[PDB]
Amino acid sequence: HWGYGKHNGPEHWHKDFPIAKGERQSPVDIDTHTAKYDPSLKPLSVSYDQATSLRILNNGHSFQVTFDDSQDKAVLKGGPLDGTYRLLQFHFHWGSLDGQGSEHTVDKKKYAAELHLVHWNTKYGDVGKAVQQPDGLAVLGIFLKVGSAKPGLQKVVDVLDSIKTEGKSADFTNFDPRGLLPESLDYWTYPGSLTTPPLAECVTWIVLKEPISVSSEQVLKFRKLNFNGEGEPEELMVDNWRPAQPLKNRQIKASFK
Ligand SMILES: OC[C@H]1O[C@@](CO)(O[C@H]2O[C@H](CO)[C@@H](O)[C@H](O)[C@H]2O)[C@@H](O)[C@@H]1O
Numbered sequence: 001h002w003g004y005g006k007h008n009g010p011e012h013w014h015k016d017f018p019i020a021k022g023e024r025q026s027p028v029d030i031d032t033h034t035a036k037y038d039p040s041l042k043p044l045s046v047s048y049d050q051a052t053s054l055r056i057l058n059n060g061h062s063f064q065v066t067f068d069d070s071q072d073k074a075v076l077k078g079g080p081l082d083g084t085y086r087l088l089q090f091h092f093h094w095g096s097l098d099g100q101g102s103e104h105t106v107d108k109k110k111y112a113a114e115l116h117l118v119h120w121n122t123k124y125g126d127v128g129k130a131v132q133q134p135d136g137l138a139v140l141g142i143f144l145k146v147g148s149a150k151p152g153l154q155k156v157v158d159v160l161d162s163i164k165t166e167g168k169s170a171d172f173t174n175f176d177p178r179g180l181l182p183e184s185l186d187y188w189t190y191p192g193s194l195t196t197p198p199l200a201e202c203v204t205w206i207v208l209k210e211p212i213s214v215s216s217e218q219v220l221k222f223r224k225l226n227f228n229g230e231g232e233p234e235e236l237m238v239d240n241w242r243p244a245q246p247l248k249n250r251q252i253k254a255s256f257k
């Protein structure tokens with residue numbers, strides 16, 4: 001199946017998913033000088049107070065924390081969005097070394113990692129239906145740089161040893177994703193896609209300008225995961241990022257002057 005290696009990585013994905021060469025693919029490079037401040041954009045509303053985390057899992061391409069999305073608990077609204085989008089899961093992309101790992105780039109700068117908080121539009125009733133709509137999903141993207149530890153990330157780091165290989169999962173209740181957010185909600189936004197197969201063009205991207213810092217030890221633990229299932233071994237889970245795709249006929253808008 002698809003992956004990030006030489007024979008199954010991003011340059012191969014178009015064969016099974018022709019939309020890989022489509023008009024609104026993600027990620028992209030964010031050219032900070034070209035992105036235009038849009039005074040009509042609204043503050044982003046990130047309401048995560050009643051989030052209910054369920055599980056943590058290694059899906060063979062990242063690790064992911066899942067949430068109960070059957071009611072409006074943890075929701076994203078405002079900013080570029082019309083309506084309400086429910087948090088279903090978050091996951092990460094990271095590198096083999098600190099100078100790569102992010103999917104979006106900023107003036108071609110790659111960060112060590114990137115956090116994606118994936119939300120779907122309640123007007124479509126479930127995430128499967130939402131991925132079939134141009135405004136079905138909103139993904140909040142947050143850059144990670146290496147420096148001080150992020151305390152809110154540690155609960156995640158400490159259980160990664162239990163989900164080393166594809167297919168493994170664990171209980172992961174009472175996790176508060178507010179602890180993964182930077183101070184500022186200044187953001188860039190543009191219409192794009194899922195960055196993993198099926199690459200559906202269903203995402204409004206909201207990428208925060210301010211990175212969070214994580215420690216060397218925290219990201220080191222990401223790098224011990226495996227793409228492979230137990231017994232297939234082994235493909236170390238590193239460099240699970242899609243590179244920047246052509247911007248084509250799109251404008252990136254900034255929420256800040
Ligand atoms: O990040 C995508 C990746 O996560 C999985 C679960 O491991 O799917 C989750 O997220 C999808 C949206 O991106 C949802 O469509 C799906 O319902 C949810 O479980 C993988 O299937 C997917 O490749």
Ligand SMILES: [Zn+2]
Pocket residue numbers: 091092093116195
């Ligand atoms: Zn992602």
